[PDB]
Amino acid sequence: VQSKIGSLDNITH
Amino acid sequence: VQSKIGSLDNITH
Amino acid sequence: VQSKIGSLDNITH
Amino acid sequence: VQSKIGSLDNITH
Amino acid sequence: VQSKIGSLDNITH
Amino acid sequence: VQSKIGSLDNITH
Amino acid sequence: VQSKIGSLDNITH
Amino acid sequence: VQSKIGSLDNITH
Amino acid sequence: VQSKIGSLDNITH
Amino acid sequence: VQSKIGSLDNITH
Amino acid sequence: VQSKIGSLDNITH
Amino acid sequence: VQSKIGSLDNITH
Amino acid sequence: VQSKIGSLDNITH
Amino acid sequence: VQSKIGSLDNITH
Amino acid sequence: VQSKIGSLDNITH
Amino acid sequence: VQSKIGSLDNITH
Amino acid sequence: VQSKIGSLDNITH
Amino acid sequence: VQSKIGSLDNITH
Structure with a gap:
């Protein structure tokens, strides 16, 4: 509800 | 509800 | 509810 | 039972 | 049962 | 039972 | 709900 | 809810 | 809720 | 559920 | 649930 | 739940 | 939602 | 939600 | 939520 | 649910 | 739920 | 829940 x-x-090899 | x-x-090899 | x-x-190899 | x-x-492998 | x-x-392999 | x-x-391996 | x-x-990766 | x-x-990675 | x-x-990694 | x-x-005169 | x-x-005159 | x-x-005159 | x-x-008059 | x-x-008048 | x-x-008048 | x-x-006799 | x-x-006799 | x-x-007789 009204969230983001x-x-x-964020998996960076 | 009204969310984003x-x-x-974000998997970057 | 109204949260972010x-x-x-953040897994950086 | 076993429901949502x-x-x-967000399942990642 | 086993429902949504x-x-x-978001299932990734 | 076993529900949400x-x-x-967020399950990562 | 009646379940058997x-x-x-449940195996999750 | 009646369950059996x-x-x-439950195995989680 | 009646459960058996x-x-x-439960194994968690 | 499994009730009696x-x-x-209901009688009205 | 399993009740009686x-x-x-209910009678009204 | 398992009650009686x-x-x-309820009678009203 | 907004249902019965x-x-x-058991309504009597 | 907003339901019965x-x-x-058991309503009598 | 906002439900019965x-x-x-058992309402009598 | 976005209710207005x-x-x-509500009157109950 | 976003209720207004x-x-x-509410009157109950 | 965002209620207004x-x-x-509420009157109860």
């Missing part, structure tokens, strides 16, 4: 997600996982 | 998703996974 | 997530995991 | 309501799953 | 209502699944 | 309501799961 | 399960295995 | 389960294994 | 489980194993 | 009502009797 | 009501009786 | 009501009786 | 689900109504 | 779920109503 | 869940109402 | 109600009058 | 109600009057 | 109510009057 930018990123959950 | 920008990105979940 | 910037990032959960 | 309003959930978010 | 209003969910988001 | 409004949850977020 | 003989055996349940 | 013989055996339950 | 014979054996329950 | 011995008699549902 | 011996008699549901 | 011996008699539900 | 699994209910019993 | 699994309820019994 | 698993309730019994 | 102007006015709700 | 102007005024709620 | 202007005024709630």
Whole structure:
């Protein structure tokens, strides 16, 4: 409800 | 409800 | 509810 | 049983 | 049983 | 039983 | 809800 | 909710 | 909620 | 669920 | 759930 | 849940 | 949502 | 949500 | 939420 | 759910 | 749930 | 839940 997600996982090899 | 998703996974090899 | 997530995991090899 | 309501799953391997 | 209502699944391999 | 309501799961391996 | 399960295995990666 | 389960294994990585 | 489980194993990594 | 009502009797004069 | 009501009786005169 | 009501009786004159 | 689900109504006048 | 779920109503006048 | 869940109402006048 | 109600009058006899 | 109600009057006899 | 109510009057006889 009126929320945001930018990123959950940022997996950089 | 009135929410946003920008990105979940950003997997860069 | 009116919350934000910037990032959960930042896994840099 | 083994159900979901309003959930978010981000499964990565 | 083994059902979903209003969910988001992001499964990556 | 073994259910979810409004949850977020981020499982990484 | 009436449910019967003989055996349940949840494996997540 | 009435539930019956013989055996339950949850393995998470 | 009425529940019956014979054996329950939760393994988390 | 697995319930009983011995008699549902509503009389108005 | 597995309950009883011996008699549901509502009389109005 | 596994409960009883011996008699539900409401009379109005 | 905004419904009458699994209910019993006994209205007398 | 905003519902009547699994309820019994016995209204007399 | 804002509901009547698993309730019994016995209203007489 | 995005509900709007102007006015709700409920009388039970 | 995003509910709005102007005024709620409830009378029970 | 994001609820708004202007005024709630409740009378029980």
